[PDB]
Amino acid sequence: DTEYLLQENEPNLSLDQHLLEDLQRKKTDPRYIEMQRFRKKLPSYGMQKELVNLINNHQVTVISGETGCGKTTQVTQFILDNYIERGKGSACRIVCTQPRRISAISVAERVATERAESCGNGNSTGYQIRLQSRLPRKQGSILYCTTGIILQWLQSDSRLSSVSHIVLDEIHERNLQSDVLMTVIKDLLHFRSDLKVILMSATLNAEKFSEYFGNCPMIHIPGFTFPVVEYLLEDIIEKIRYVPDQKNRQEKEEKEAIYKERWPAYIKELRTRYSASTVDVLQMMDDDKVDLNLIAALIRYIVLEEEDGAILVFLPGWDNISTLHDLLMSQVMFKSDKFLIIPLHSLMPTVNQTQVFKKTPPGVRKIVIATNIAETSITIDDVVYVIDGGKIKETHFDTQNNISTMSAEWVSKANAKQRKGRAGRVQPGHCYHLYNGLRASLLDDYQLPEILRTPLEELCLQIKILRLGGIAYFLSRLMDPPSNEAVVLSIKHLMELSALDKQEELTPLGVHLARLPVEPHIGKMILFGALFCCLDPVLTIAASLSFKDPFVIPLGKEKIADARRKELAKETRSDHLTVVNAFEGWEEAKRRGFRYEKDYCWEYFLSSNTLQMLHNMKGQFAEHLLGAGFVSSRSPKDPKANINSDNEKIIKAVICAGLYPKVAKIRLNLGKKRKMVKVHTKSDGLVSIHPKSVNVEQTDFHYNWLIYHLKMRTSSIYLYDCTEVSPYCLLFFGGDISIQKDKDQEIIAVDEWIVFQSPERIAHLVKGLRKELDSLLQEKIESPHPVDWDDTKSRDCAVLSAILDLIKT
Ligand SMILES: [Cl-]
Secondary structure (H helix, E strand, C coil), X not given: CCHHHHCCCCCCHHHHHHHHHHHHHHHCCHXXXXXXXXXXXXXXXHXXXXXXXXXXXXXXXXXXXXXXXXXXXXXXXXXXXXXXXXXXXXXXXXXXXXXXXXXXXXXXXXXXXXXXXXXXXXXXXXXXXXXXEECCCCCCEEEEEEHHHHHHHHHHCCCCCCCCEEEECCHHHCCHHHHHHHHHXXXXXXXXXXXXXXEEEXXXXXXXXXXXXXXXXXXXXXXXXXXXXXXXXXXXXXHHCCCXXXXXXXXXXHHHHHHHHHHHHHHHHHHHHCCHHHHHHHHHCCCCCCCHXXXXXXXXXXXXXXXXXXXXXXXXXXXXXXXXXXXXXXXXXXXXXXXXXXXXXXXXCXXXXXXXXXCCCCCCEEEEEECHHHHCCCCXXXXXXXXXXXXXXXXXXXXXXXXXXXXXXXXXXHHHHHHHHCCCCCCCEEEEECCCHHHHHCCCCCCCCHHHHCCCHHHHHHHHHCCCCCHHHHHHCCCCCCCHHHHHHHHHHHHHCCCECCCCCECHHHHHHHCCCCCHHHHHHHHHHHHCCCHHHHHHHHHHHHCCCCECCCCCCHHHHHHHHHHHHCCCCEHHHHHHHHHHHHHHHHHCCHHHHHHHHHHHCECHHHHXXXXXXXXXXXXXXXXXXXXXXCCCCCHHHCCCCCCHHHHHHHHHHHHCCCEEEECCCCXXXXXXXXXXXXXXXXXXXXXXXXXXXXXXXXXXXXXXCCEEECCCEEECCEEEECHHXXXXXXXXXXXXXXXXXXXXXXXXXXXXXXXXXXXXXHHHHHHHHHHHHHHHHHCCCCCCCXXXXXXXXXXXXXXXXXXXX
């Protein structure tokens, strides 16, 4: 994925002349001319001279423009075309980062079109994302990529030598990776004077970026929109006469308190300007959930009562998107071939985000159901109607309880304004917001930056792999530095994962974990899934921890669902293996045909949509492992990586590799039916098992130890998903080993509180094996290749076989 980077930037006079002549021919080309007239309508085009002069005269510049300004497709072109016009065309190598893969591809393909060229193929414009590229010509070129690709590039060339201009787009989004890239770039530019840096924001709050970069020049590009009418939840209900089918810590609590206090009076005044039935329906509305039936009813109204145009729907996540898609397709209206209904979500297959293609006649109407990714520059043609569900998925991090969650939260005003602007690019539009007027007045101006709300482990490994020095020091230099407590927790988890040594340097395991673009506990799990040849069930479990588990509890069926779930557990005493068995049973049912598949899901109360998403994530995980050289195939099911996939002990040991140090000691029950099942933890004292767990009532445990992933605190701490494991799993994959005796007995302690009976020689064996495993992983840093398990005698097989023999007890 580094091929463009490794190219050397070498200006050429002959190429300068040739490109200047290429421009002359383009000026006469009907195709090019037609495209130029489209461009001239964009506000960016009109100030092109001042943008290029600012960039040419200053090393760092900040560009702000709102929706429709055209910065993302235009500014790269302005630089290249200015160089070409000046007879310096070959001196340009322009790289522009995008927040998502689909944006990189879509923008690059659109710019190629506007230049009357195909994308890649040695032409002026192309893209690079992980494992897929259309690369432009070496000199006088534009490359769209992701932030991830730049971070990868910095491992190979930390100077970004051959780049003349780096354009960081959509910076207002404040993604973790953008913030770090920004600090890295700031350090580089001070050292190398020939790099131009251009920072682009879609919102007008960009002064902070200018200050960060030393109060560098700023410039504004006007947005472009036709007028868009906005509707609140009151207006929508009133307009369509909606008939229902039925009937993130302290500063959120503050805002809800204010909402609650202003609620009665808001409602009271609302009865002044709206029908009584509207207010009563609005009053019944659930704030926690987007109402998908309302969205269906609104789409129905638009189609029947309003003018032609495409409809864009914004929903928090995959669950909502697939649910609304099924809901629409279950109505004979939308079954027609005059509707095209397209899901858009970032974790579906690559150009399975299919929404770019020229839509076929407008006798057929496009309905795009998308996440917040449709807010960015993406080609969706002819949108007259935007339905804003009002929510966005956000990660939050409770550092006092060490709990990280993903939830749907209210959009900011900036989000809402971007969604509004999507309806006004073609003709006068309509944007329907599913929040009420009181909610609107209480939205935040902007979202809190990710760096403040997110676990830092993945970022910390990036810092180390890029040799940026001390972790806490670097993080303190970011534009918004994270809290000390988030930093201390992050560094601690990485040491307990054995990713960092006590001196905060990468271990060989850590090097490999840094090469996997997932959280390190997931990375460690899938890595040992690869090394131990468990791949398929381990990837299932990993996907399940990353998104969520497939089970649902329908009303009235609670007791029945719990029994079916425990049935799926069999004797494993594992929530994680329960998901494996569910998943395998589902796949087997799928082969027999869709009746059997739906049947299986109703029998075990499984979400088909969740299962499908888990399956897609598995493929991704395998791709990451293939690129890191730990598997030879992109198939989770590849026979050679699955020889151990039926072995319960081996899979359990891999789950333990991933989830340590989240470890609990069982408090023995002693046939007391009046006492809840509880467990001891290092950090939290005695806690409870969640009722959803297959172990919640278990009296029969074969070992004394659990590992868990999800912890929640309501009136007290509950463990959501846990797996019984043998002490040998903790012994190999856990913390420091110590030996103690007490007379007769040989004792081993792991991280000092995990204490069990075991011969002293086992402790020495394990210390030996850990070091041999380090050396194995060390050798693969420079020469990554999958372990060949068909060659015994190989000494990699010897070491890994010995580890497997140990954790089989
Ligand atoms: Cl059933």
